[PDB]
Design an enzyme around this catalytic site. Structure first.
Site, PDB file in Angstrom:
ATOM      1  CG  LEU A  57       1.123   7.779   9.558  1.00  0.00           C
ATOM      2  CD1 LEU A  57       0.765   6.883   9.151  1.00  0.00           C
ATOM      3  CD2 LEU A  57       1.793   7.349  11.364  1.00  0.00           C
ATOM      4  N   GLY A  58       3.598  11.377   8.943  1.00  0.00           N
ATOM      5  CA  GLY A  58       4.902  12.124   8.899  1.00  0.00           C
ATOM      6  C   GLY A  58       4.001  13.545   7.847  1.00  0.00           C
ATOM      7  CB  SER A  59       5.068  16.208   7.331  1.00  0.00           C
ATOM      8  OG  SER A  59       5.921  16.890   7.278  1.00  0.00           O
ATOM      9  CB  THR A  75      17.924  13.766  -2.250  1.00  0.00           C
ATOM     10  OG1 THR A  75      16.770  13.948  -2.179  1.00  0.00           O
ATOM     11  CG2 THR A  75      18.860  13.740  -1.558  1.00  0.00           C
ATOM     12  CD  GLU A 105       0.485  -1.828   2.088  1.00  0.00           C
ATOM     13  OE1 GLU A 105       0.820  -1.978   0.735  1.00  0.00           O
ATOM     14  OE2 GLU A 105       0.582  -3.200   2.121  1.00  0.00           O
ATOM     15  CG  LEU A 106      -0.486   1.790   8.712  1.00  0.00           C
ATOM     16  CD1 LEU A 106      -0.210   3.052   8.860  1.00  0.00           C
ATOM     17  CD2 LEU A 106      -1.875   1.020  10.040  1.00  0.00           C
ATOM     18  CB  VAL A 107       4.267   1.632   5.015  1.00  0.00           C
ATOM     19  CG1 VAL A 107       5.690   0.706   5.235  1.00  0.00           C
ATOM     20  CG2 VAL A 107       3.530   1.185   3.518  1.00  0.00           C
ATOM     21  CG  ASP A 116      12.228  11.141  -4.358  1.00  0.00           C
ATOM     22  OD1 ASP A 116      13.945  10.528  -4.599  1.00  0.00           O
ATOM     23  OD2 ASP A 116      11.398  11.445  -4.005  1.00  0.00           O
ATOM     24  CE  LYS A 159       1.917  12.060  -0.486  1.00  0.00           C
ATOM     25  NZ  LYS A 159       2.616  10.836  -1.236  1.00  0.00           N
ATOM     26  CB  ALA A 188       2.163  15.840   1.353  1.00  0.00           C
TER      27      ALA A 188
HETATM   28 MG   LIG Z   1       2.903   7.926  -2.997  1.00  0.00          MG
END
Ligand SMILES: [Mg+2]
Ligand SMILES: [N+]
Ligand SMILES: [N+]
Ligand SMILES: [N+]
Length: 300
Positions: A18-20, A179, A93-95, A138, A41, A24
């Protein structure tokens, strides 16, 4: 703290990525006993103190500690925590609805009223966290998510608590992270940090939501940081022509150098642009709108 030492594959069927992150990677998974879906994760441990290829246990345990504490429809929920030799695995939780800004980049139009609806959801999440003395540190578009893209009124979810801190009375917290175009001046100048830094980021996010332009983004990273410290920003007429006075007043009270002079979350919820006191104050948000041309270019 002890996490579940069992094999996560015994209890879960994992699938696509789903991402990176740098240390992670997130995968979609399904719990075998219930059939329900979550997000897994995988966070890399550094294992050796002199290594720069992982996350320290101190940082991982802080994130989990904060995640275990929070229960709110507008923040992400922790389900389980697994640990092996190389990784700490968070079952979250899946978002699935993707970023808020990529959802708003597909609409025909967007009035100030419709935008305050999504902003209130964010304000409600932050209101919750600050009530527990938790600073996110963040807050940025990448971390504002939708639970489900395909419903009448989509729900906002705040994610990624890897920089989050519980505010300690008695010990000032100083650090340089995050950021550049979204961080507060005190972060830039290595000053004491508190909940006020989240309020700055909200100001930045609102600015971008209404215009599609970043208020402090410079040609270099060093130029951006300089703009933040000087509070060098403008309501360019190219972007803020159809923007009400109340929206600008809302932003102007958040983008303030001195943190004590900055608007708080309980104040921001009382602001007439968010909570119209009377009459045609509602007309300003109800009538006026966001330019969807310059906004479609941002998410692009
Ligand atoms: Mg977190
Ligand atoms: N289980
Ligand atoms: N101080
Ligand atoms: N400027």
């Amino acid at each position: 703290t002890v996490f579940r030492q069992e094999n996560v594959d015994d209890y879960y069927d994992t699938g696509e990525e789903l991402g990176s992150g740098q240390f992670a990677v997130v995968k979609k998974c399904r719990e075998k006993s219930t059939g329900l879906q979550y997000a897994a994760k995988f966070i890399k441990k550094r294992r050796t103190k002199s290594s720069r290829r992982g996350v320290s246990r101190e940082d991982i345990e802080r994130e989990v500690s904060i995640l275990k504490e929070i229960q709110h429809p507008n923040v992400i929920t922790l389900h389980e925590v697994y640990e092996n030799k190389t990784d700490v695995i968070l079952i979250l939780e899946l978002v699935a609805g993707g970023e808020l800004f990529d959802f708003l980049a597909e609409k025909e139009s967007l009035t100030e009223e419709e935008a305050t609806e999504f902003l209130k959801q964010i304000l409600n999440g932050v209101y919750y966290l600050h009530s527990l003395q938790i600073a996110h540190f963040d807050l940025k578009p990448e971390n504002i998510m939708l639970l489900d893209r395909n419903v009448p009124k989509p729900r906002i979810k705040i994610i990624d608590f890897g920089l989050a801190h519980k505010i300690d009375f008695g010990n000032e917290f100083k650090n340089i992270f995050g950021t550049p175009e979204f961080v507060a001046p005190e972060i830039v100048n290595y000053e004491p940090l508190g909940l006020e830094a989240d309020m700055w980021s909200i100001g930045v996010i609102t600015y971008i939501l209404l215009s599609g332009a970043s208020p402090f983004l410079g040609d270099t990273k060093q130029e951006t940081l300089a703009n933040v410290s000087a509070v060098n920003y403008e309501f360019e007429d190219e972007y803020f022509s159809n923007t009400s006075a109340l929206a600008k007043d809302f932003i102007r009270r958040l983008l303030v150098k001195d943190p004590k002079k900055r608007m708080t979350i309980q104040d921001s919820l009382q602001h007439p642009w968010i909570k119209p006191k009377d009459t045609q104050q509602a007309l300003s948000r109800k009538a006026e709108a966001v330019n969807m041309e310059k906004f479609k270019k941002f998410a692009a």
